[PDB]
């Protein structure tokens, strides 16, 4: 039974010259919005915050 560790961050703040690459997302582009949670996919493929 092989046992692996995992790590992920939550609640960071990206620095001042904010860049982008994608061409799809239209809603979350504002500067005043900040994420306070991160979404992790479960074992049975269920996204949990």
């Amino acid at each position: 039974r092989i046992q692996y560790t995992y790590f992920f961050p939550v609640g960071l703040h990206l620095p001042v010259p904010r860049y982008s690459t994608s061409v799809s997302v239209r809603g979350v582009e504002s500067p005043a919005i900040q994420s306070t949670e991160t979404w992790v996919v479960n074992k049975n493929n269920v996204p949990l915050c």
Binding site: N45, V46, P47, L48
Partner: protein, 49 residues
């Protein structure tokens, strides 16, 4: 009838039409009070979420 604020992420994955998961197979055999506690009591977050 359902509140307007229930998350849509519950609806893409197969689950119960009530808000709580009701699989009693996981519970101890011949324990009705432990099995009723899974269905109803809200000191315990979901077996799904």
């Amino acid at each position: 009838p359902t509140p307007v604020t229930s998350d849509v992420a519950y609806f893409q994955t197969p689950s119960n039409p009530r808000g709580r998961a009701a699989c009693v197979v996981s519970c101890d055999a011949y324990s009705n009070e432990s099995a009723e506690r899974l269905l109803y009591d809200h000191s315990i977050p979901d077996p799904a979420y």
